[PDB]
């Protein structure tokens, strides 16, 4: 999940020879679907990513500060004079052939975290195993190989 509720799981993993990559070759850590954004209405993730990029270029750490005056305009002008795009979009390349890409991509540093429900506690399958003496049915529990 994110810091805003974007839970899910992992589709696949490729490697850097076909990852999308930029002029400075800053290969991504992870890629998700834009269709999370205009349905869950999560602007806070995007403003966190933009402030995170200007913090990374500055050397200063950032600020969130729930009821204050830090705006997208000040963030934009600061990152602009640090020599990048005024909003966070970026020229980007094909993973496979390295042709130009049509659109441009908001892309940068962001804070994620790791959950507890890992896959090995949830994978479970059974055929012709133990019997419950009260009911002659398959017993419960992933621990004792249930059904």
């Amino acid at each position: 999940a994110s810091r805003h509720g974007q839970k899910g799981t992992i589709g696949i993993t490729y490697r850097r020879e076909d990852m999308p990559f930029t002029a400075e070759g800053i290969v991504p850590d992870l890629i998700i679907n834009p269709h999370a954004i205009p349905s869950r209405m999560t602007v806070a993730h995007l403003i966190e990513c933009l402030l995170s990029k200007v913090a990374a270029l500055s050397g200063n750490e950032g600020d969130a500060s729930p009821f204050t005056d830090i705006t997208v305009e000040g963030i934009s002008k600061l990152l602009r004079e640090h020599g990048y795009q005024s909003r966070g979009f970026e020229v980007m390349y094909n993973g496979h052939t390295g042709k130009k890409l049509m659109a441009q991509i908001f892309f940068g540093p962001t804070y994620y975290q790791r959950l507890r429900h890992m896959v090995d506690d949830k994978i479970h399958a059974r055929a012709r195993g133990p019997m419950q003496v009260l009911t002659r049915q398959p017993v419960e529990g992933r621990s004792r190989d249930g059904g």
Partner: peptide, 20 residues
């Protein structure tokens, strides 16, 4: 305007060392 996007603390501790 300055609009205070970021702030300093020990520089002011020092300014009050000269002030006091």
């Amino acid at each position: 305007t300055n609009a205070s996007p970021f702030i300093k603390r020990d520089r002011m501790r020092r300014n009050f060392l000269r002030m006091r």
